Amino acid sequence: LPDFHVSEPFTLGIELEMQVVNPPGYDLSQDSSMLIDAVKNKITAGEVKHDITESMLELATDVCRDINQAAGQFSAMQKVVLQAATDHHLEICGGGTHPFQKWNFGYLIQQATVFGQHVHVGCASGDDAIYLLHGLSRFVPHFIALSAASPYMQGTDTRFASSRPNIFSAFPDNGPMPWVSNWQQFEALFRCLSYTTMIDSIKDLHWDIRPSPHFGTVEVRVMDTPLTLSHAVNMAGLIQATAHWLLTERPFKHQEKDYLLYKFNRFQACRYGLEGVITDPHTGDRRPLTEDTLRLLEKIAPSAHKIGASSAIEALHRQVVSGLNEAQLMRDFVADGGSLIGLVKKHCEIWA
Amino acid sequence: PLPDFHVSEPFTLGIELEMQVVNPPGYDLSQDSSMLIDAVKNKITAGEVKHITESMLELATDVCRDINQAAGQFSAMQKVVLQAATDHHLEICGGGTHPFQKWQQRTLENFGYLIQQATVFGQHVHVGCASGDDAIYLLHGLSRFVPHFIALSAASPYMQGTDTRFASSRPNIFSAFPDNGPMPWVSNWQQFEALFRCLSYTTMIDSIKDLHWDIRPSPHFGTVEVRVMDTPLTLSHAVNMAGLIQATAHWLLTERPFKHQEKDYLLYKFNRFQACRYGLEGVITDPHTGDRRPLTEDTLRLLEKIAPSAHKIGASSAIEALHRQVVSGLNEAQLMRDFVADGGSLIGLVKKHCEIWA
């Protein structure tokens, strides 16, 4: 593995996997490679690629300093993209799963395509990356609940706020990174994992949060892709302010037992969103995520000012206080008599 | 708190087989394994026959001293069950999954669509031990061969009518639950209680029985329970898998051949996946040395180390039959695939599996 790249203070990078739908039926497209081959010169900052499926358009920012910069690169990418979409009679929308799309790892891979948002935070060293990773792992339940946007799967209400994460549960590498206390221990772990033929690079390990020594960042990849660009930017600010608070204040001394209930709390967030309950593994104390998330928001507020994300922190606070659950909001649209086709159309208009 | 760990006679055996009750002439999972059970009330001389899941019949031996006593208790329950079946026009067969069946507690609330799949069927083996520390040592020893147990028992390539491409797909059914796979690491009984105390702080678990681990300790029965295997097509195989586990348990606790450390589990999920997907053709990788070898080869090394222990406890037959299987280059999953490749239907396949069990 290469030396851990020394990145600039808390740099930021965002990747969004958007859905490409084909009107008027509004199911996922399969001919969206021509979208990239339509913006292959119409994007100055950031990057746009596509999956092997052709139903996903990935937008990525370059390395930014704050959410205002990310927001600008996304805004500029959005105009071109929307133009190309219209030019090809296609539409773009966010969300963790397409509501009705129906589909060697055999059948595990034969499930509908899903859409996630990844956020990269710069670190100065490997030991800092490891500290940042463990610190962020504590709020993964919170990051999932705040971004949950995938209640529907193949036409049925799964009851989950975010069902997308269930699609990877059978894979060996799913979930939290195995524990390591520092960068040296991480290199040994990666060395051991590399023994299998399945693992050749870190890119192959789909942990919820993973470090990158080549880019000098820690990557959070547990979130559903948001319905709007602004919410995606706010989640990124949230993660950047938490990173700043963790690394500058070092509020915790990380212990393996901090991860004991990691999967149980992760499940509660996927299944119930902010109404899920988080349990402390050391004391057994339980708290709804709405309450606990408000406490995270108040704790990282000063750090949010410092790196320019206080506006994201304030908006997330307003949303937790009022409820605003996209999962439910989708269910209400449908409960009010709207159709899944209509819901996808609504989401296309919303993203624009 | 958890019960004190019951002092069992070491190496005794308790076996459970969840059998499939199918309905001719369509051969789908039946919804009457109840009237069949009520038909065998009392008839069972030793052991027990119970359901949960109207398509499932569970055959459980009592606590046995050796595999022969076990082969005995099953053979007798089998005759009884086979006759009750005949009188109700139902049939019985093994296998980890029903090849074409499609789906129709406080678990629904929590998991929703995740548990609304097809019924899966496993063989469970309980090995008695003297204490909690011994149970922990025994569990870690057995965790090293979980890939071997799965591969040797693989018999669930089909799921809901479709070929999954796995040898044993049943072990994935619980991949979405927070407590599936290997038990979190603890080094002795004292730490295990601390582990269980932690886990029970959550809503879905108040007892050892709510845990979906591959291998689970039972302070109540005074046993270490291996629960990763698919229910085999025959009773002889079920009995032979129990003898392997018993022989390995004997080798582990008497020779104490490994010095257990958390790093031993590092590649547990990758090796577990290789077994599920390719059966004995799977490759096993050591996390320490990085050595890679197919499960066929590794299973033969296991059979060698446990031959002496098997002789003393009366399970050499199990070991020899397993050895022939390993070098036979044939596996239930491929035999099911060949059947279908040759023109057979999944329905025909189930009918054939009922004739095999009988």
From Swiss-Prot, chain A:
Q: Does the keyword Cytoplasm apply?
A: no
Write one Pfam family the protein is assigned to. GCS2
Would the keyword ATP-binding be found if you checked this record's keyword annotation?
A: yes
Q: What is its EC number?
A: 6.3.2.2
Query: Which reactions appear under catalytic activity for this entry?
Result: L-cysteine + L-glutamate + ATP = gamma-L-glutamyl-L-cysteine + ADP + phosphate + H(+)
The molecular function terms in GO held by this entry are: ATP binding; glutamate-cysteine ligase activity; ligase activity, forming carbon-nitrogen bonds; protein homodimerization activity
A GO biological process this protein is involved in?
modified amino acid biosynthetic process
Q: Which SUPFAM superfamilies match?
A: Glutamine synthetase/guanido kinase (SSF55931)
Q: Which InterPro entries match?
A: GCL_type2/YbdK_subfam, GCS2, Gln_synth/guanido_kin_cat_dom, YbdK
The alphabetized UniProt keywords are:
ATP-binding, Ligase, Nucleotide-binding
**NCBIfam families xref list:** gshA_cyan_rel (TIGR02050), PRK13516.1 (NF010040)
Kindly give any further remark recorded in the entry: Catalytic activity was tested towards all 20 common amino acids, but was only observed with L-cysteine.
Which proteins does it associate with, and in what oligomeric form?
Homodimer.
The entry's function note states: ATP-dependent carboxylate-amine ligase which exhibits weak glutamate--cysteine ligase activity. However, because of the low catalytic rate, the question remains whether L-cysteine is the actual biological substrate.
The family line of this record is: Belongs to the glutamate--cysteine ligase type 2 family. YbdK subfamily.
What HAMAP family does this protein map onto? Glu_cys_ligase_2
Which named protein is this?
Putative glutamate--cysteine ligase 2
Provenance organism: Escherichia coli (strain K12)
From Swiss-Prot, chain B:
**Top enzyme class:** ligase
Q: Name one GO molecular function term.
A: ATP binding
Identify the EC number(s): 6.3.2.2
Instruction: Kindly list the cysteine pairs connected by disulfide bridges.
Output: none
Which Gene3D superfamilies does the record associate with it?
3.30.590.20
Q: What does this protein do?
A: ATP-dependent carboxylate-amine ligase which exhibits weak glutamate--cysteine ligase activity. However, because of the low catalytic rate, the question remains whether L-cysteine is the actual biological substrate.
Cite any additional comment in the entry. Catalytic activity was tested towards all 20 common amino acids, but was only observed with L-cysteine.
Q: Which HAMAP family match?
A: Glu_cys_ligase_2
The protein's name in its UniProt record:
Putative glutamate--cysteine ligase 2
- Per the UniProt record, the source organism is Escherichia coli (strain K12)
Q: Which gene encodes it?
A: ybdK
